[PDB]
Amino acid sequence: LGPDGAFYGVVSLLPFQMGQSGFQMSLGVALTVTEEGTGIQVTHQFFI
Amino acid sequence: NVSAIYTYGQPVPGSVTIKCCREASSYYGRKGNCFKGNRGICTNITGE
Numbered sequence: 789l790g791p792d793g794a795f796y797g798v799v800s801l802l803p804f805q806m807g808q809s810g811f812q813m814s815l816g817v818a819l820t821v822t823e824e825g826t827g828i829q830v831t832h833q834f835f836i
Numbered sequence: 837n838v839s840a841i842y843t844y845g846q847p848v849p850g851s852v853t854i855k856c857c858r859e860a861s862s863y864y865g866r867k868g869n870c871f872k873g874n875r876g877i878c879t880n881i882t883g884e
C-alpha cells in the first residue's frame with residue numbers, strides 16, 4: 789500500500805474445504821502490517 | 837498383483853491400466869445437505 793493507506797485483500801476459499809466435515813465453524817485470520825524502514829509490525833487476529 | 841493368460845496358457849503382452857476411486861459422503865443435497873464432498877478424487881496408473 790502507500791497511496792493513502794488501503795488494501796483490498798480478496799482471498800479465494802477454493803483451497804479451503806468448504807462443503808465437507810473438516811469444518812470447525814471458525815476461520816482464524818491474522819493481519820500484520822509492517823513498514824519499509826522500521827522493522828516494527830502491528831498484528832491483529834480475529835475469528836470469522 | 838495382476839496376471840493375465842490366454843486359453844492355452846500363454847502370456848499376453850499389452851497395456852494394463854488400473855483406475856480406483858469412490859464417492860465421499862453423498863448426504864442427499866438440497867433441503868438436506870446441498871454441497872458435499874467432491875466428485876471423488878480419482879487416481880489412475882498404467883503399466884506394461
Ligand SMILES: *[C@@H]1O[C@H](CO)[C@@H](O)[C@H](O)[C@H]1NC(C)=O
Pocket residue numbers: 794795796797
Ligand atoms: C473497501 O470498501 C468497500 C467495502 O469492502 C469495497 O467495495 C472497496 O473496494 C474497498 N476499498 C479498498 C481500497 O479496498
Ligand SMILES: *[C@@H]1O[C@H](CO)[C@@H](O)[C@H](O)[C@H]1NC(C)=O
Pocket residue numbers: 855879880881
Ligand atoms: C486416468 O484416466 C483419466 C480418465 O478421465 C484421465 O483423465 C487421466 O489422465 C488418466 N491418468 C493419467 C495418469 O493419465
